[PDB]
Structure formats: structure tokens, C-alpha cells
């Protein structure tokens, strides 16, 4: 009669793996990284260039 438990849903426990149950998981897997998008240039046609 053994309990698997849940993390407290506290973001502190879930990241450490603390668990009320029998097992403390290694950690929170990974779902991948979310970067921030690189915003766009307006290019230079709007103004004469002349390198």
C-alpha cells in the first residue's frame, strides 16, 4: 500500500523533485527552450545608401 504522491504544485518543489510520495523524480524533464524572436529590419530602400 504505497503512495506515489504529487509535488506540492509549488514551483519550488517541482523543480527540485521533492515529492510527498515514495519517489523523488530526478527533475522536471525538459520541454525545450523558448527564445525571443529577432525583430525585423526595415531595410534601407527608404534612404539613399552610398556605401
Amino acid at each position: 500500500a504505497e503512495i506515489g504522491g504529487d509535488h506540492g504544485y509549488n514551483a519550488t518543489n517541482i523543480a527540485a523533485g521533492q515529492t510527498s510520495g515514495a519517489v523523488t523524480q530526478i527533475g522536471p524533464a525538459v520541454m525545450g527552450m523558448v527564445r525571443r524572436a529577432i525583430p525585423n529590419l526595415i531595410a534601407f530602400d527608404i534612404c539613399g545608401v552610398q556605401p
Binding site: 500500500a1 504505497e2 523533485g17 515514495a22 519517489v23 523523488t24
Partner: protein
């Protein structure tokens, strides 16, 4: 842990049976009789000779109990359950528990 205790929870010892079994205390060690079970440090024992701890002068109980085993006053009750124990449809069947902790 299983390996530290020295006690057997699956057998004629049982677990819920260890409730009705009376621990050794300085008062209770005097009242033991032949065939009376007792647990100390959760290791159940069985009394071979009535009024054990009559000739044993050790005030310290842990070692007095430990020199009863060698003088065969009380044996260790690790013992296998007679088959009729688990068939009664009321059966306390020993539970086996684990815990998994990480060291990070």
C-alpha cells in the same frame, strides 16, 4: 531498512500482530511466562522458559535480553507462518515498502 533491523515482518511474527505483542519494559520483563511473545526494538522474541530474567542481573535491558538469547531463556521469534495463517480470509499480510531519495 530491512538489513539493519534483524526483525521479520512476514511469518508467524506478522506486522499487525506486533501491535498485540507487548514490548519489553522494566515492568513487563518480570511478567513473562513460557510461550509469551515480546518485541524489543521491533524484533519479536518468544519466551522458552517461564519467568525469564530471573537469574539475569543486568539492569540494562538491551544487554539483559541479549544474554537471555545465549542462555536460551528467550529465543528469537523470526519464524515462518504456519500455512493456516494466510488462508483465514482475515489475514494480515506483511507489507514491503520502499523509498527513493536523491542525493543532489
Amino acid at each position: 531498512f530491512t538489513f539493519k533491523t534483524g526483525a521479520t515482518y512476514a511469518g508467524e511474527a506478522g506486522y499487525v500482530d506486533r501491535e498485540q505483542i507487548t514490548e519489553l519494559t522494566e515492568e513487563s520483563k518480570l511478567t513473562l511466562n513460557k510461550g509469551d511473545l515480546f518485541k524489543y526494538n521491533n524484533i519479536v522474541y518468544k519466551v522458552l522458559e517461564d519467568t525469564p530474567f530471573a537469574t539475569i542481573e543486568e539492569s540494562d535491558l538491551e544487554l539483559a535480553l541479549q544474554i537471555a538469547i545465549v542462555l536460551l531463556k528467550v529465543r528469537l521469534f523470526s519464524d515462518a507462518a504456519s500455512t493456516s495463517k494466510f488462508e483465514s480470509s482475515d489475514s494480515e499480510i506483511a507489507d514491503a515498502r520502499f523509498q527513493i531519495n536523491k542525493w543532489q
